[PDB]
């Protein structure tokens, strides 16, 4: 009787990690920490925030973050709490639980994720919230829900042999149905071009706005490899209905750039290579209570256009652009990847 | 308008650390961890418990402790949360706060306590409880209160030049009055003989049973050096009144032994020396909601007598003796030293 509510439904708080590993974040994560502070501070205007830092980083996080953000000590390999935090479910006796999916470092065998694996159970232990363990590998960034019985995902990620090669698509779909409380799963073939680290997480490709409506990463440039992925997703959405028999409205959200890691950015990481195409999309935003917390990549034309489209799309939410989001995407993710909502009960 | 309530007043939870340092706990703390589990499990029958472990120990603590005990990650140098946890105060607007006294490793300059110093603020941050910082050095084990305006302490500890040599007795007393919400401080000259590590903490010498009544560490052996300390305290209690003008009832609680570290015990620590007299007293018990959690040192005569006296003294509480408490005292403390109550509001 539990289900995953939509991200726009009310939250009691948001969980965020704290970056530090010098081999993934340039210059010892100094720039990324400034942006994590900016994101946490912005979200905290709208809902309570907990930032989780290692022992070595706790004082730094506590100094940078404002007093009304809670700072706890939770050790991790890295700081992508969308994927390593628990996925909370509600039953409207316990009324909230967390799903502890198995983590495997985004298909990483094919190199240590043991601390990251413990993040789900540690957060649930802090909150004294029951844990539902699952042997299936899954990351929260790979699924999206409308809270009304529909889930969207990508085949590129969930059917990759680096995830659950013991399972067929039907078996995976049945676990999503049972654990997320959904009745229909929409399988986009592919996520964002260039998102090789996650194998095409849906949260970088498409998300719900409301039941029956999605934002879709888009480019008007038919010569760019993103075009065929976005067009294929657009065609799928235009050909199917949701779990309640609604047609989809699709709103295009144009990708920046393309953006590429510079020599200076790559040199700061102790592998991240000069010229690497960045997996950048404005779709990787977080919905906080009454707010959209949206990336800004330092590409003025597309940054301003994304704020315009998000403001029109979410007319009852305050849209907040976060300067410096390029510093998150240099390490492979964005605002949605670093957050995990806790639904209110 | 805040004051420290008595330890027998209702608690919302109890905070406990988790031992691990091989240079203070024999055999890598394996024996002490069994006893910390025993104490936490016993307290948890009566009130909620949080055990705080380092990243390296979190899984071990989580395995040993029962499911209804919360396990959080808080780093520390060592695990004496009576002295390194916050002292909570209540105002019956915020109704609870924590005092963050300065810690200095029990006068330790005259050798690293930087992580221990952060424990107070970390616990208050987890709970989102306001923090009152104090520049004065103080450990919670060095004071005891009745919740009705009286505090007892020792001169041996608080007037030692290794604590607050900038302050006179009057200045220290005024800080206790202001921060604990007390109107009279009773200064025992001395704590327990042999308690050189803490310089005679009151919690190993004497504690309140109820307003107007104390338990006092005692020996009938006039040849033992404890006798003159206990007799001096008995005479003081018999000569003064409390903050409300009550005379004191004194109940004697006979020390075990004396007990001495064995060669085998000392050899297990990676300094703790063979033959060291142990600073052992049954006074170092914890009052949980409706329970007395009391040491048992493996000295059958005095262990049984302590349970008899505590059961008579606290007729409305369940007395629970903890087997293996000698393993705590080998490292310089006991059940009261490893706990810190959080008062209910
Ligand atoms: Na701060
Ligand atoms: Na991958
Ligand atoms: Na356990
Ligand atoms: Na000392």
Author numbering:
A (entry chain A), B (entry chain A): 12 to 103, 112 to 129, 134 to 293, 300 to 374
Share the article's original sentences:
Herein, we describe the structural characterization of AIH from Medicago truncatula (MtAIH), the model legume plant. The enzyme is responsible for the second step of the AGM pathway of PUT biosynthesis, that is the hydrolytic conversion of AGM to N-carbamoylputrescine (NCP) with the release of ammonia. AIH belongs to one of the seven types of guanidine-modifying enzymes (GMEs). It is a member of the pentein superfamily that is characterized by the propeller-like arrangement of five repeated motifs that form a narrow channel with a central, negatively charged core. The monomer of MtAIH is no different in this matter, i.e., five motif repeats (I–V) are arranged around fivefold pseudosymmetry axis that is aligned with the catalytic tunnel in the core of the protein.
In this work, we present the high-resolution crystal structure of non-liganded MtAIH and the structure with the reaction product analog—6-aminohexanamide (AHX). The envelope with twofold symmetry restraints and ab initio electron density map that was calculated with no information about the molecule symmetry clearly correspond to the MtAIH dimer in the crystal lattice where two subunits are related by twofold symmetry. It is worth to note that both crystal structures, MtAIH and MtAIH-AHX, present different crystallographic symmetry with one and four chains in the asymmetric unit, respectively. In the case of the unliganded structure, the dimer is created by a crystallographic twofold axis, while in the MtAIH-AHX complex, there are two almost identical dimers in the asymmetric unit. The close vicinity of the MtAIH active site is surrounded by two very flexible regions built mostly by long loops. One is the gate-keeping loop covering the active site (residues 291–314), which is a linker between repeat IV and V. The other concerns the fragment 122–136 which belongs to the repeat II, where α4 is located. The gate-keeping loop is very variable in plant AIHs except for Arg301 and Arg306. Both regions are disordered in the non-liganded MtAIH structure, more precisely fragments between Glu129-Cys134 and Pro300-Tyr-293 were excluded from the structure due to the lack of electron density maps that would show their conformation. However, in both MtAIH crystal forms, this interface area between two subunits is preserved and, taking it together with SAXS and MALS results, it is, in fact, responsible for the formation of MtAIH dimers.
